[PDB]
Amino acid sequence: GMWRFYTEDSPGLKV
Amino acid sequence: SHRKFSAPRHGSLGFLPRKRSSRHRGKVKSFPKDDPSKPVHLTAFLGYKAGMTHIVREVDRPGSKVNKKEVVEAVTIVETPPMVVVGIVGYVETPRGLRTFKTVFAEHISDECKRRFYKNWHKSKKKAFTKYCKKWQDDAGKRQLDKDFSSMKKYCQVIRVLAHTQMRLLPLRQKKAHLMEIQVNGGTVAEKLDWARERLEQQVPVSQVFGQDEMIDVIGVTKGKGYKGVTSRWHTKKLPRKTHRGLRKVACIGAWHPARVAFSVARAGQKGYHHRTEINKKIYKIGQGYLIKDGKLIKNNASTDYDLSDKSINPLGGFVHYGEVTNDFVMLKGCVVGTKKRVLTLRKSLLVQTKRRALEKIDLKFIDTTSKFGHGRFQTVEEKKAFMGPLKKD
Amino acid sequence: VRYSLDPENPTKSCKSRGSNLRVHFKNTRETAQAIKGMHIRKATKYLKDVTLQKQCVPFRRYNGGVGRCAQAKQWGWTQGRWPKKSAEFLLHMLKNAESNAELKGLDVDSLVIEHIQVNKAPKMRRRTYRAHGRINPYMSSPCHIEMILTEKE
Amino acid sequence: SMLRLQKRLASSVLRCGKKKVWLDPNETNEIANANSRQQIRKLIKDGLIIRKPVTVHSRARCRKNTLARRKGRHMGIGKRKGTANARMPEKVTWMRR
RNA sequence: GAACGUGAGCUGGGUUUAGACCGUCGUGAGACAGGUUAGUUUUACCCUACUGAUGAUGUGUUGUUGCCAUGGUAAUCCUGC
RNA sequence: ACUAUCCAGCGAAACCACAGCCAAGGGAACGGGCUUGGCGGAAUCAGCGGGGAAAGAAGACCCUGUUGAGCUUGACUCUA
RNA sequence: CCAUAUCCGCAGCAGGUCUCCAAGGUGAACAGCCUCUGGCAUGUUGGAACAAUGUAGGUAAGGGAAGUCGGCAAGCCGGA
RNA sequence: GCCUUGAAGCCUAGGGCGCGGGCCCGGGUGGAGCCGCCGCAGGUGCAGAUCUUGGUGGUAGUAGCAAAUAUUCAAACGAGAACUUUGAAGGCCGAAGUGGAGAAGGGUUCCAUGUGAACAGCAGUUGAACAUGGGUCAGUCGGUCCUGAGAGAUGGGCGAG
Ligand SMILES: [Mg+2]
Ligand SMILES: [Mg+2]
Ligand SMILES: [Mg+2]
Ligand SMILES: [Mg+2]
Ligand SMILES: [Mg+2]
Ligand SMILES: [Mg+2]
Ligand SMILES: [Mg+2]
Ligand SMILES: [Mg+2]
Ligand SMILES: [Mg+2]
Ligand SMILES: [Mg+2]
Ligand SMILES: [Mg+2]
Ligand SMILES: [Mg+2]
Ligand SMILES: [Mg+2]
Ligand SMILES: [Mg+2]
Ligand SMILES: [Mg+2]
Ligand SMILES: [Mg+2]
Ligand SMILES: [Mg+2]
Ligand SMILES: [Mg+2]
Ligand SMILES: [Mg+2]
Ligand SMILES: [Mg+2]
Ligand SMILES: [Mg+2]
Ligand SMILES: [Mg+2]
Ligand SMILES: [Mg+2]
Ligand SMILES: [Mg+2]
Ligand SMILES: [Mg+2]
Ligand SMILES: [Mg+2]
Ligand SMILES: [Mg+2]
Ligand SMILES: [Mg+2]
Ligand SMILES: [Mg+2]
Ligand SMILES: [Mg+2]
Ligand SMILES: [Mg+2]
Ligand SMILES: [Mg+2]
Ligand SMILES: [Mg+2]
Ligand SMILES: [Mg+2]
Ligand SMILES: [Mg+2]
Ligand SMILES: [Mg+2]
Ligand SMILES: [Mg+2]
Ligand SMILES: [Mg+2]
Ligand SMILES: [Mg+2]
Ligand SMILES: [Mg+2]
């Protein structure tokens, strides 16, 4: 289906 | 959190609905109040904008560094033929405001006034005021109309007069006249009816309204610019070069919880063609027209007491985009709203004038009639020829 | 075949029909609601003019995105467009109908358009090629038409 | 009507391209019934089919300016772009000597 | 102050992946609350709100001239004789 | 200058409980819907990006699991 | 056929895929600019008008890094 | 027991029953089998499961049909021309080319006549599409021959095979 991001970005980031 | 540094806002919220107006002629919101001591006079007048130029004069402001010296300053020229009266209207005062009570038109109304009706004058039959004008050449109409002026003496407090212009006398493409209501301010109601009832169907020049060295107001509609952004309509900072989705924008609007956009924030829309009102513009000069005793006379439009050259106000090549002025005009200090060929309204000042910068008086020395269609360097053709000489026009 | 709304007097009326026609349903529907109730000779002028951009059709239900015009003040509206293609195919039909009336022996220059009906139809299938290896359908949207004319002036 | 076949064939007989071939815009009937060779070579002889001439490319402009560069002109300091060794090298000058 | 206002408004210097360098610790793979360098920032054509633009209700139709509810609202400081 | 804009012709998608004007109150403690007040007028056009705790990917951070795998060794049991 | 349409890339996909031949002028020159032989119809459509925001190009009075994490980007010098 | 003097199934502002599960009548369509009682047996009753298969909507006549400078005038065929063809004019490729020939791969795409349903993301009188027919000629051009890095039988050895 549609693409929506590169898997090494992971837009929700909170460490 | 708060704002790091401080700054003031961009624009006024007074002029807020920046929409393009619903008119082409300046409306007057308020006229001056009236002392019943005064003689009977008028308050306003219609004129058109022609052009601009500059002027030299001498200065008698004391205590200054420019006193007893010459200065250079710009002006605007406004063409103003004499208007014509056609009709009357009387108002009355009520706890809801004012109310239009009754009106009267005259017996003869020229066609240039009737074109203000009749969107399509070309395929019309021109059957306006045909039946109303039949109760002037009549017996009962003389009884019918004159039973009404008596009412207006009795049940009214405010008198206004309908006038229109003379558009044959201009170079423009237009033929329709412009109407306007004007207020009569004087002693008493009965006087103003008698003054007007005599003055009906007659002409009214400018020198019967205004004089020299007087502050007035100017009312007219500004110059269009169309759809614009916020860096032209509101004058915000341009963002820097490294922005992605555009640069001539305002970034933030509001914050989260007032979860709505407020009318205080800048947006992108119309600019220009608005209604405005400016005050305290001076009159320097009132010029005559072209006229004929036995031949021509076009000197006194633009001849000071000093230069004594047989010159008119008109430049070489005429006024740009306008034409040729052949009529009486007025000369304002500074600048005004609107394009050329546009209709202006000229209202007396509603205040008292005691500042020396208003009370002072003026006498001109020089006026510039160079051509504005380039870099003009000559005042008149005659000097242009005497300097250069004979060309191949031989 | 079997029409909708079989008429009131089958001796003073004619009829025509088309099936499986490559025009857009949406524009064509609206053009029919504007031509309805007219005398045929009036309407043929109406449809030439649309083709020449001198009159218009107002888009009243299917109006998303559609633009504003000056000719739709006659109809009491703002929006309008000039669907050429639909106009022609309607014109070809009026001919078929007008002839049949001549064959049954009717007064031709007193005829009225009473009933026009448009309907959808089976959809044709193509494809278009998008990013990241994807495919999507480029489908078509044709129409049927049927219509009735009677003799009333 | 269609005449692309007739164009192609005439190219091969005249040994020119298809941009050098003139067909008569008026006598198109008699050409379209030329669906072969020997229906064509007749028509070349009759004059309906012609080989155009070359577009001119002249040289007087060059011959003229070179005739000046012999005498010396157009050779100053501000017309030179390569080192002297590129224009006329030293090794050659040595060998002549 | 307003989700320590505001990343489909910017930037991405720092911090907080993947490579790598020193010091201290661990036999060791490896760790550091120690330091240093390089490093992909997506989508508006939907509903609303906001700004601008047509039109709508009624007054028999149509036009000219005008009144006012209601809402906004703006002027501010210093020097010199 | 190419677009966006308008017209002719052809014509998709993601997404979608129902839907879509605000303040305060209480409530799973930050409501489009409830309660008390403010108010409320067809159908639409170009934009912009405040909200919809907007779309995408059964949270890689943290914990649990008597679920795993890569690597090391002085863990246990074995082996070429 | 041998490639901005016959090959592989889901497709007449701005991608990728081994070689031969090789004129005139300027100029050091298979650089770049114009032309002849041979080839084409502007690269999956057209017409009207010149708003906003964009993308690619340019210019700017006086001052000259005061901007910004950082002279990032642009500009100066440029051949003999 | 019901039935081609009309079964099942389906539709229904119609008449009615039962607390409910559900049912009986009436009217239209339709064309061949179906039901009630006492017992038996079970692949036996759906709103959902980021359920499975198929189909259809708002979105929406919207976003879009913008990398590489460029078209114009007349005539002809034709029901029919912004796009076919012919001519003329203006322009690009600029010999490391948008030119003329070939290997790998494809496999009839090649050539003529005809067509305009479908396809050629607009159109088309055109087409590498559709239909019907035709077309590749060798003592000397290549293979075939030789061997290369290397692969691989016999004898022998090993191995449950
Ligand atoms: Mg502050
Ligand atoms: Mg950036
Ligand atoms: Mg000028
Ligand atoms: Mg695509
Ligand atoms: Mg692909
Ligand atoms: Mg925050
Ligand atoms: Mg972001
Ligand atoms: Mg945000
Ligand atoms: Mg960093
Ligand atoms: Mg690292
Ligand atoms: Mg007020
Ligand atoms: Mg748009
Ligand atoms: Mg609230
Ligand atoms: Mg609370
Ligand atoms: Mg909600
Ligand atoms: Mg938002
Ligand atoms: Mg989880
Ligand atoms: Mg998980
Ligand atoms: Mg446990
Ligand atoms: Mg494993
Ligand atoms: Mg051990
Ligand atoms: Mg070039
Ligand atoms: Mg083209
Ligand atoms: Mg192509
Ligand atoms: Mg500067
Ligand atoms: Mg600094
Ligand atoms: Mg700073
Ligand atoms: Mg740089
Ligand atoms: Mg049977
Ligand atoms: Mg069973
Ligand atoms: Mg079951
Ligand atoms: Mg179900
Ligand atoms: Mg359930
Ligand atoms: Mg569009
Ligand atoms: Mg393109
Ligand atoms: Mg070739
Ligand atoms: Mg080639
Ligand atoms: Mg090959
Ligand atoms: Mg097509
Ligand atoms: Mg072929």
Short mmCIF file of all heavy atoms in Angstrom, two decimals, chain B residues 146-182, unseen atoms left out:
data_model
loop_
_atom_site.label_atom_id
_atom_site.label_comp_id
_atom_site.label_asym_id
_atom_site.label_seq_id
_atom_site.Cartn_x
_atom_site.Cartn_y
_atom_site.Cartn_z
N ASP B 146 -47.31 73.51 -3.08
CA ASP B 146 -47.13 74.58 -2.11
C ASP B 146 -47.83 74.31 -0.80
O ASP B 146 -47.59 75.02 0.18
CB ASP B 146 -47.65 75.89 -2.70
CG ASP B 146 -46.84 76.35 -3.89
OD1 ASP B 146 -45.64 76.02 -3.96
OD2 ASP B 146 -47.41 77.04 -4.76
N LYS B 147 -48.70 73.30 -0.75
CA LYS B 147 -49.17 72.78 0.52
C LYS B 147 -48.12 71.93 1.23
O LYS B 147 -48.36 71.51 2.36
CB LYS B 147 -50.44 71.95 0.31
N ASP B 148 -46.99 71.67 0.58
CA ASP B 148 -45.96 70.80 1.13
C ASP B 148 -44.80 71.59 1.72
O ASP B 148 -44.25 71.20 2.75
CB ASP B 148 -45.44 69.87 0.04
CG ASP B 148 -46.53 68.95 -0.49
OD1 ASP B 148 -47.47 68.66 0.27
OD2 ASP B 148 -46.44 68.54 -1.67
N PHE B 149 -44.41 72.69 1.07
CA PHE B 149 -43.39 73.56 1.63
C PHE B 149 -43.81 74.11 2.98
O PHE B 149 -42.96 74.40 3.83
CB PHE B 149 -43.12 74.70 0.68
CG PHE B 149 -42.45 74.28 -0.57
CD1 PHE B 149 -43.20 73.98 -1.68
CD2 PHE B 149 -41.09 74.18 -0.64
CE1 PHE B 149 -42.59 73.58 -2.83
CE2 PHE B 149 -40.48 73.79 -1.78
CZ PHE B 149 -41.23 73.49 -2.89
N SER B 150 -45.11 74.26 3.20
CA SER B 150 -45.61 74.69 4.50
C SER B 150 -45.34 73.65 5.57
O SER B 150 -44.94 74.00 6.69
CB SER B 150 -47.10 74.98 4.39
OG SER B 150 -47.81 73.81 4.03
N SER B 151 -45.56 72.38 5.25
CA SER B 151 -45.25 71.30 6.19
C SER B 151 -43.79 71.35 6.60
O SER B 151 -43.46 71.31 7.79
CB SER B 151 -45.55 69.96 5.53
OG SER B 151 -45.17 68.90 6.38
N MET B 152 -42.91 71.46 5.62
CA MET B 152 -41.48 71.40 5.84
C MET B 152 -40.99 72.56 6.68
O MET B 152 -39.95 72.45 7.34
CB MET B 152 -40.81 71.36 4.47
CG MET B 152 -41.15 70.11 3.69
SD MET B 152 -40.80 70.22 1.94
CE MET B 152 -39.03 70.26 2.01
N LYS B 153 -41.71 73.67 6.68
CA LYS B 153 -41.39 74.75 7.61
C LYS B 153 -41.73 74.36 9.04
O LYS B 153 -41.17 74.92 9.98
CB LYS B 153 -42.15 76.00 7.24
CG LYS B 153 -41.67 76.65 5.99
CD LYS B 153 -42.52 77.82 5.61
CE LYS B 153 -42.01 78.49 4.36
NZ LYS B 153 -42.88 79.62 3.98
N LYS B 154 -42.65 73.42 9.20
CA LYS B 154 -43.30 73.17 10.48
C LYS B 154 -42.84 71.90 11.16
O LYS B 154 -42.74 71.87 12.39
CB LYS B 154 -44.80 73.09 10.26
CG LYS B 154 -45.61 72.99 11.51
CD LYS B 154 -47.09 72.96 11.20
CE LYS B 154 -47.62 74.32 10.77
NZ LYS B 154 -47.46 75.38 11.83
N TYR B 155 -42.60 70.84 10.40
CA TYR B 155 -42.38 69.51 10.94
C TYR B 155 -40.97 69.01 10.67
O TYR B 155 -40.71 67.82 10.82
CB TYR B 155 -43.39 68.55 10.33
CG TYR B 155 -44.83 68.75 10.74
CD1 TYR B 155 -45.86 68.38 9.90
CD2 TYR B 155 -45.17 69.35 11.93
CE1 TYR B 155 -47.16 68.57 10.25
CE2 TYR B 155 -46.47 69.54 12.29
CZ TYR B 155 -47.47 69.15 11.45
OH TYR B 155 -48.78 69.34 11.80
N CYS B 156 -40.05 69.90 10.30
CA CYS B 156 -38.70 69.53 9.95
C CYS B 156 -37.70 70.42 10.65
O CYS B 156 -38.02 71.51 11.14
CB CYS B 156 -38.48 69.61 8.45
SG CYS B 156 -39.43 68.38 7.54
N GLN B 157 -36.47 69.92 10.70
CA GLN B 157 -35.36 70.56 11.38
C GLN B 157 -34.10 70.61 10.54
O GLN B 157 -33.22 71.42 10.84
CB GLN B 157 -35.03 69.84 12.68
CG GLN B 157 -35.96 70.12 13.84
CD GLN B 157 -37.31 69.47 13.70
OE1 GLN B 157 -38.33 70.14 13.58
NE2 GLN B 157 -37.32 68.15 13.74
N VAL B 158 -33.98 69.78 9.52
CA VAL B 158 -32.76 69.62 8.74
C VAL B 158 -33.13 69.67 7.27
O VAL B 158 -34.01 68.93 6.83
CB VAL B 158 -32.05 68.30 9.07
CG1 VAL B 158 -30.86 68.10 8.20
CG2 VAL B 158 -31.64 68.30 10.49
N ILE B 159 -32.43 70.51 6.52
CA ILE B 159 -32.69 70.70 5.11
C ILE B 159 -31.46 70.27 4.35
O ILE B 159 -30.34 70.54 4.77
CB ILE B 159 -33.02 72.17 4.77
CG1 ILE B 159 -34.19 72.69 5.59
CG2 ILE B 159 -33.34 72.29 3.33
CD1 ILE B 159 -35.48 72.06 5.31
N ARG B 160 -31.69 69.60 3.23
CA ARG B 160 -30.62 69.22 2.34
C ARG B 160 -31.06 69.45 0.91
O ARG B 160 -32.25 69.43 0.59
CB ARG B 160 -30.23 67.79 2.53
CG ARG B 160 -29.54 67.54 3.82
CD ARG B 160 -29.21 66.09 3.99
NE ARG B 160 -28.67 65.83 5.30
CZ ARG B 160 -28.32 64.63 5.74
NH1 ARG B 160 -28.44 63.56 4.98
NH2 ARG B 160 -27.85 64.49 6.96
N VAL B 161 -30.07 69.64 0.06
CA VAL B 161 -30.28 70.03 -1.32
C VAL B 161 -29.62 69.01 -2.22
O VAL B 161 -28.53 68.51 -1.91
CB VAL B 161 -29.72 71.44 -1.59
CG1 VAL B 161 -29.81 71.75 -3.03
CG2 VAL B 161 -30.48 72.43 -0.83
N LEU B 162 -30.28 68.68 -3.32
CA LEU B 162 -29.74 67.80 -4.33
C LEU B 162 -29.08 68.61 -5.41
O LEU B 162 -29.68 69.56 -5.94
CB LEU B 162 -30.83 66.93 -4.93
CG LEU B 162 -31.45 65.90 -4.02
CD1 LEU B 162 -32.58 65.23 -4.67
CD2 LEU B 162 -30.44 64.89 -3.67
N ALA B 163 -27.86 68.25 -5.75
CA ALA B 163 -27.14 68.87 -6.83
C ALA B 163 -26.42 67.82 -7.65
O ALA B 163 -26.17 66.71 -7.19
CB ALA B 163 -26.14 69.88 -6.32
N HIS B 164 -26.08 68.20 -8.87
CA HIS B 164 -25.34 67.35 -9.76
C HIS B 164 -24.38 68.20 -10.56
O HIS B 164 -24.43 69.43 -10.53
CB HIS B 164 -26.26 66.55 -10.67
CG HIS B 164 -26.97 67.36 -11.69
ND1 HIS B 164 -28.07 68.14 -11.40
CD2 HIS B 164 -26.76 67.49 -13.02
CE1 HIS B 164 -28.49 68.73 -12.50
NE2 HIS B 164 -27.71 68.35 -13.50
N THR B 165 -23.51 67.53 -11.30
CA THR B 165 -22.44 68.18 -12.01
C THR B 165 -22.78 68.38 -13.48
O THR B 165 -23.86 68.02 -13.97
CB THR B 165 -21.16 67.36 -11.91
OG1 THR B 165 -21.33 66.12 -12.60
CG2 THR B 165 -20.85 67.06 -10.52
N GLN B 166 -21.82 68.96 -14.18
CA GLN B 166 -21.88 69.22 -15.61
C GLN B 166 -20.73 68.45 -16.24
O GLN B 166 -19.57 68.83 -16.09
CB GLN B 166 -21.76 70.71 -15.87
CG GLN B 166 -22.96 71.46 -15.46
CD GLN B 166 -22.77 72.94 -15.59
OE1 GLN B 166 -21.70 73.42 -15.92
NE2 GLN B 166 -23.82 73.67 -15.31
N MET B 167 -21.06 67.38 -16.95
CA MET B 167 -20.08 66.45 -17.46
C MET B 167 -19.82 66.63 -18.95
O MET B 167 -18.88 66.02 -19.47
CB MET B 167 -20.56 65.03 -17.19
CG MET B 167 -20.59 64.67 -15.73
SD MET B 167 -18.98 64.47 -14.98
CE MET B 167 -18.51 62.98 -15.80
N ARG B 168 -20.62 67.44 -19.64
CA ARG B 168 -20.28 67.86 -20.99
C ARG B 168 -18.96 68.61 -21.01
O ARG B 168 -18.22 68.55 -22.00
CB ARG B 168 -21.37 68.76 -21.54
CG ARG B 168 -22.67 68.08 -21.78
CD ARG B 168 -23.67 69.06 -22.35
NE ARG B 168 -24.05 70.07 -21.36
CZ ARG B 168 -23.65 71.34 -21.35
NH1 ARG B 168 -22.81 71.83 -22.26
NH2 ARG B 168 -24.09 72.14 -20.39
N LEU B 169 -18.67 69.33 -19.94
CA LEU B 169 -17.61 70.31 -19.91
C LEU B 169 -16.24 69.70 -19.70
O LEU B 169 -15.26 70.45 -19.54
CB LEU B 169 -17.90 71.31 -18.80
CG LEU B 169 -19.16 72.13 -18.99
CD1 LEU B 169 -19.38 72.95 -17.78
CD2 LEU B 169 -19.10 73.01 -20.21
N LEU B 170 -16.14 68.39 -19.67
CA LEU B 170 -14.93 67.66 -19.35
C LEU B 170 -14.47 66.83 -20.54
O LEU B 170 -15.24 66.59 -21.47
CB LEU B 170 -15.17 66.73 -18.16
CG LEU B 170 -15.01 67.36 -16.79
CD1 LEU B 170 -16.14 68.25 -16.47
CD2 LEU B 170 -14.93 66.34 -15.73
N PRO B 171 -13.22 66.37 -20.53
CA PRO B 171 -12.73 65.59 -21.67
C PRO B 171 -13.04 64.12 -21.57
O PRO B 171 -12.79 63.39 -22.54
CB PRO B 171 -11.22 65.80 -21.58
CG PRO B 171 -11.00 65.84 -20.14
CD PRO B 171 -12.16 66.53 -19.52
N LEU B 172 -13.55 63.67 -20.44
CA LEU B 172 -13.67 62.26 -20.15
C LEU B 172 -14.64 61.58 -21.11
O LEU B 172 -15.39 62.21 -21.85
CB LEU B 172 -14.15 62.06 -18.73
CG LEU B 172 -13.25 62.59 -17.64
CD1 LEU B 172 -13.93 62.43 -16.33
CD2 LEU B 172 -11.94 61.89 -17.66
N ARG B 173 -14.60 60.25 -21.06
CA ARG B 173 -15.48 59.40 -21.83
C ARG B 173 -16.88 59.32 -21.26
O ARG B 173 -17.78 58.82 -21.94
CB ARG B 173 -14.86 58.00 -21.87
CG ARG B 173 -15.56 57.02 -22.76
CD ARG B 173 -14.75 55.75 -22.87
NE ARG B 173 -15.39 54.80 -23.77
CZ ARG B 173 -16.32 53.92 -23.41
NH1 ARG B 173 -16.74 53.85 -22.16
NH2 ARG B 173 -16.84 53.11 -24.30
N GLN B 174 -17.09 59.83 -20.06
CA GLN B 174 -18.31 59.62 -19.32
C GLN B 174 -19.29 60.75 -19.57
O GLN B 174 -18.91 61.87 -19.92
CB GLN B 174 -18.00 59.50 -17.84
CG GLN B 174 -19.12 58.99 -16.99
CD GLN B 174 -18.74 58.84 -15.56
OE1 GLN B 174 -17.61 59.14 -15.17
NE2 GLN B 174 -19.67 58.40 -14.74
N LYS B 175 -20.57 60.44 -19.39
CA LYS B 175 -21.66 61.38 -19.61
C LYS B 175 -22.61 61.44 -18.43
O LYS B 175 -23.25 62.47 -18.21
CB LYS B 175 -22.40 61.00 -20.87
CG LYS B 175 -21.61 61.22 -22.12
CD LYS B 175 -22.42 60.82 -23.33
CE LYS B 175 -21.72 61.15 -24.63
NZ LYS B 175 -20.50 60.36 -24.82
N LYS B 176 -22.75 60.34 -17.68
CA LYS B 176 -23.55 60.36 -16.48
C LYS B 176 -23.03 61.38 -15.48
O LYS B 176 -21.82 61.50 -15.28
CB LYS B 176 -23.57 59.02 -15.79
CG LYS B 176 -24.30 57.96 -16.49
CD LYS B 176 -24.39 56.78 -15.58
CE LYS B 176 -24.98 55.58 -16.25
NZ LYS B 176 -25.13 54.51 -15.29
N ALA B 177 -23.95 62.07 -14.84
CA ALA B 177 -23.63 62.98 -13.76
C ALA B 177 -23.60 62.23 -12.44
O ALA B 177 -24.03 61.08 -12.33
CB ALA B 177 -24.66 64.09 -13.70
N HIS B 178 -23.10 62.91 -11.42
CA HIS B 178 -23.06 62.40 -10.06
C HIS B 178 -23.96 63.27 -9.20
O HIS B 178 -23.86 64.50 -9.24
CB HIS B 178 -21.65 62.44 -9.49
CG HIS B 178 -20.69 61.50 -10.15
ND1 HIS B 178 -19.91 61.87 -11.22
CD2 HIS B 178 -20.36 60.22 -9.87
CE1 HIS B 178 -19.14 60.86 -11.57
NE2 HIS B 178 -19.40 59.85 -10.77
N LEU B 179 -24.84 62.64 -8.43
CA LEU B 179 -25.71 63.33 -7.50
C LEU B 179 -25.13 63.32 -6.11
O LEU B 179 -24.35 62.45 -5.74
CB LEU B 179 -27.07 62.67 -7.44
CG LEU B 179 -28.04 62.81 -8.58
CD1 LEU B 179 -29.16 61.88 -8.38
CD2 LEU B 179 -28.60 64.17 -8.57
N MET B 180 -25.56 64.29 -5.31
CA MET B 180 -25.21 64.26 -3.90
C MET B 180 -26.13 65.18 -3.13
O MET B 180 -26.56 66.22 -3.63
CB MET B 180 -23.76 64.67 -3.69
CG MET B 180 -23.23 64.35 -2.34
SD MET B 180 -21.47 64.67 -2.23
CE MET B 180 -21.49 66.44 -2.30
N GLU B 181 -26.40 64.78 -1.90
CA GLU B 181 -27.09 65.62 -0.94
C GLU B 181 -26.10 66.49 -0.20
O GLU B 181 -25.04 66.03 0.22
CB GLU B 181 -27.86 64.77 0.05
CG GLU B 181 -29.08 64.16 -0.54
CD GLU B 181 -29.80 63.24 0.42
OE1 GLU B 181 -29.28 63.00 1.53
OE2 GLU B 181 -30.90 62.76 0.07
N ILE B 182 -26.46 67.76 -0.04
CA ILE B 182 -25.65 68.73 0.67
C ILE B 182 -26.53 69.39 1.71
O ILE B 182 -27.71 69.65 1.47
CB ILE B 182 -25.06 69.80 -0.26
CG1 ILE B 182 -24.20 69.15 -1.33
CG2 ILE B 182 -24.26 70.76 0.55
CD1 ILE B 182 -23.87 70.04 -2.45
#
